[PDB]
């Protein structure tokens with residue numbers, strides 16, 4: 001029993017984290033096979049960061065301008081190139097701790113684990129969701145750039161996030177490992193802001209299923225609804241639309257608990273309309289939207 | 303910025319997790335140097351659960367009755383002893399992935415990371431606190447016994463918890479790595495129940511200081527309180543007493559934010575009286591008590 005925000009075990013990724021220094025900038029890199037991946041903004045100084053020309057700044061650098069440290073050992077950089085907003089530093093040694101891995105791009109609503117790192121040294125692991133507005137509500141200080149996000153699907157690590165920056169509201173923006181930003185963000189110091197966020201409806205329903213499985217049943221009711229009617233309600237409360245694909249994905253949880261998705265949507269309808277009347281659900285006074293259907297099944301079964 | 307329930311990176315512990323089988327019972331063990339630590343209840347049968355005599359069950363076992371599996375490899379057990387409620391199985395191979403480590407027994411209010419494991423394989427990592435009633439609010443299914451709790455406050459792993467059982471209210475009880483239970487619990491399936499839980503006041507204050515560090519001031523007020531009056535009110539909401547030790551420990555956070563400890567105590571009094579009136583603090587609509595003063599300083603600054 002019990003239900004906790006749970007991260008994947010981080011050991012396979014810990015063995016890939018290194019320190020990358022260029023000039024006075026130090027941040028984190030990901031060392032897989034014979035390449036170190038890190039944010040391209042590592043090459044910038046402050047004046048550069050105002051309006052950088054990355055192509056031009058990069059051509060001026062030699063391999064030996066990049067100091068890469070794995071533990072106490074220096075790695076030797078033998079090549080450098082850019083892909084989108086990530087720098088790829090070819091080094092002389094393949095990482096012997098390289099796990100089986102893939103680069104994947106995730107969708108808003110999907111969750112992943114973040115291994116927060118400073119000076120190439122892992123400091124903490126926590127679970128995040130890619131928000132509908134393409135930010136993450138992480139916990140990152142200066143020096144954390146190049147920290148990564150991942151899922152583990154079997155023995156295979158799927159890397160999905162690399163940390164680039166903090167926005168002024170205190171949320172976080174970054175890229176996939178091919179250096180494509182999530183969201184309408186750029187790696188330069190200009191005015192940027194998170195768009196208005198929405199709640200991830202399918203995840204809230206998943207978490208309501210978790211609550212039931214753990215014996216928290218007070219919000220269940222005799223009513224059902226339809227997708228169209230519920231979606232009219234979701235829109236009003238700044239919830240993402242629920243699709244038939246979402247209903248399909250919750251199918252397992254529906255079967256296990258005897259609460260159809262639209263039955264559970266009637267519960268959620270009522271909660272949005274009336275609140276919780278001083279009660280809690282899984283020890284929360286707010287509706288939690290950072291567990292996916294898969295997360296709930298995995299933790300309440302596997 | 304941001305503030306998250308953050309666990310320690312788990313890799314140093316993952317490389318210590320093994321599977322221990324005795325008869326039909328399989329659970330997890332922790333392999334450090336040449337010893338595997340696991341709950342002694344691994345040697346119990348169906349009969350045994352109400353009133354096991356562990357000394358009598360154990361004398362009947364030979365080394366070869368214990369199957370220890372580290373990944374794909376069987377380890378050979380070459381000795382066994384019991385210490386309190388843990389079994390220590392001496393094995394023929396020192397663990398080459400043994401980290402620098404120590405065993406520490408923690409006090410209520412302390413936090414740690416749990417690496418939940420099944421069949422000797424890690425499933426997930428999360429943060430927990432030792433509750434005032436000596437339980438933890440974990441996430442554990444059948445087969446999770448022998449999962450451990452730890453901190454890593456430099457490169458040294460401090461093991462502080464080993465999971466033994468789930469109580470009827472769905473909370474969790476276990477031992478230190480010397481096999482002494484936290485709280486009044488025993489490894490027997492007789493009726494036992496957790497004492498009433500309370501809120502960890504010192505941690506809530508730490509978390510209020512975190513909110514200020516991260517730029518949130520709305521819940522402060524112009525008042526102060528004596529320590530004794532604070533405690534008198536706090537106890538009426540099932541909050542643990544705040545001691546002078548606790549006030550001392552919050553000294554650094556007080557100095558960083560410019561808010562005296564008893565001033566913050568006055569804020570907490572008002573929060574308990576008023577609630578949050580539709581606001582949140584660090585993204586929570588409830589007062590959080592599973593971050594310690596040390597945790598706040600580690601994550602914030």
Ligand SMILES: O=C(Cn1ccnn1)Nc1ccc(Br)c([N+](=O)[O-])c1
Nearest residue numbers: 041140141142164165166187188189
């Ligand atoms: O934001 C950070 C540091 N930090 C603090 C917490 N998490 N990250 N560095 C940074 C700021 C603005 C920008 Br536009 C860029 N950039 O060039 O992409 C980098």
Ligand SMILES: O=C(Cn1ccnn1)Nc1ccc(Br)c([N+](=O)[O-])c1
Nearest residue numbers: 343442443444466467468489490491
């Ligand atoms: O509770 C569990 C299984 N589990 C599920 C989640 N967390 N733990 N095993 C167990 C239960 C009661 C007792 Br008294 C004993 N024992 O003899 O120590 C073991």
